[PDB]
Ligand binder design. Sequence first.
Ligand SMILES: [Mn+2]
Lengths: 288, 295
Amino acid sequence: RLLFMLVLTVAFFVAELVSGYLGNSIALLSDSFNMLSDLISLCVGLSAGYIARRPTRGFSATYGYARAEVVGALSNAVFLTALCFTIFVEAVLRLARPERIDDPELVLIVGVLGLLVNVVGLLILHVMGDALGSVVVVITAIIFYVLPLKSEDPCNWQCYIDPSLTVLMVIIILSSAFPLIKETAAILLQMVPKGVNMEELMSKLSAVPGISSVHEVHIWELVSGKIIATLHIKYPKDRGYQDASTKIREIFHHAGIHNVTIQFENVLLLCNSPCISKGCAKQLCCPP
Amino acid sequence: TCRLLFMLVLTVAFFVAELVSGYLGNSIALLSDSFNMLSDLISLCVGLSAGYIARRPTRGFSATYGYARAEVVGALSNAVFLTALCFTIFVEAVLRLARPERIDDPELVLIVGVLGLLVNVVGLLIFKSEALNIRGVLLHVMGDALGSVVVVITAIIFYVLPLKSEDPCNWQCYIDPSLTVLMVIIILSSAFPLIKETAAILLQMVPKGVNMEELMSKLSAVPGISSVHEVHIWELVSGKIIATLHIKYPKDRGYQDASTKIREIFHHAGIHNVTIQFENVDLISKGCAKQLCCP
Ligand SMILES: [Mn+2]
């Protein structure tokens, strides 16, 4: 399924890239860049599926390459942002010095076929983000198709209709992609996942019976679905820690965190094992 | 920080040279390729924002490790931005190789190219997640410096020879796109290590400095330990490596003797962040076994 979509997207990205420069239409170039980003996303999803089956641990990636989806998503979003910045500059350059579409027919045909390939995805807002760019290409083509302009006549309204719609499409694509950048960065910055409410989680954690303190509660998301929590507990050492460990595990299970590595430091409110020597303080995370 | 700020101010001042107040009209086409430094402006803004975010304290119930990795994420973002711009420049140059393009007037292009080269070399001569971020910003400015070098070179070549409009394009026309392609190759080659390293800091992998080949051997060798389950080693920022080892032990003898030995081994390997969970040996569910990190 996805391989056929990938080959179609690659072929038509190349086709639109060749047509836009040859046809002198920024909207076509914008759609070509958008389909290049779409094929990059498809390749990222294929790689994610491949790595998901037969997980590959080892001495290089102890967690496996599960973060590949997130890293590829961030990289693709930044790539699309840079391509959108380039397209915005070119529109602005061609907004002050208007340029004519040399091949309205070819631009129209490539836009129609790109719109068909863009709707095949739903025939099996980013999805709107690509479909609408294709329809902008078409729109410009008809404006240059019906009521055309002779090859030896200056710029008219028909000329500034392509750069304006291209700027609007760039705005739409950037608005759809910036939240993706924010979410991927939050995942990659080891920020607490959106679903997890660490405030009440820490309250419940401090309410467990026989727990005197709680520190170094590191919660971060590996991938969409796997949340990893590293936590340090202090136990009285004449009572024990088994019941407390079970209760803490149940709490983290209720919150959706199944990866817990509770270190039950002995009992006075600081970490009992910062490092081997006092000189490790600058390197320890969250210095005391 | 201060040097990055001064670079940003200089780039702003030179770029704003197009938005004259005057009257109807904007700067008579001296901005046709002035956005080559608006890209540097954007990269500088990204670097400064990453630096500002990184300074935030490693506390609060939204980032338990703190925004220390903001510099690494900004470096990766800047590297990918530079790669995308280089791809676009390469595509434009390739389209120019098939269709030769002349230069309108070597004088103005040479003058603006010399000014841009001077700005970029002021930025270059300023002379460790911050090392990654600066490496990205310096990569971007070096990229535009190479672009300014190629525009200077094509301008001089078009200056010595007249290239009257009667004659079509000659080797002079192809001098610029070919040098642009070579410059793009150089920038991409320089940028690829940056991405390949920042994607190791992100996309959690064993740190390059860490030599796990002997780490696992020593962890097996230390007496008192009966097995090891999840040696999760990853790098938050350069110099801060975190470990999440799981360990078993005979129930009768506590983990006290072996915990200090494990911590000392990890410290000798340059790992000071270790969270050892000691799961005893008898000698919440099973549906959740699909949501773990190790099956
Ligand atoms: Mn499209």
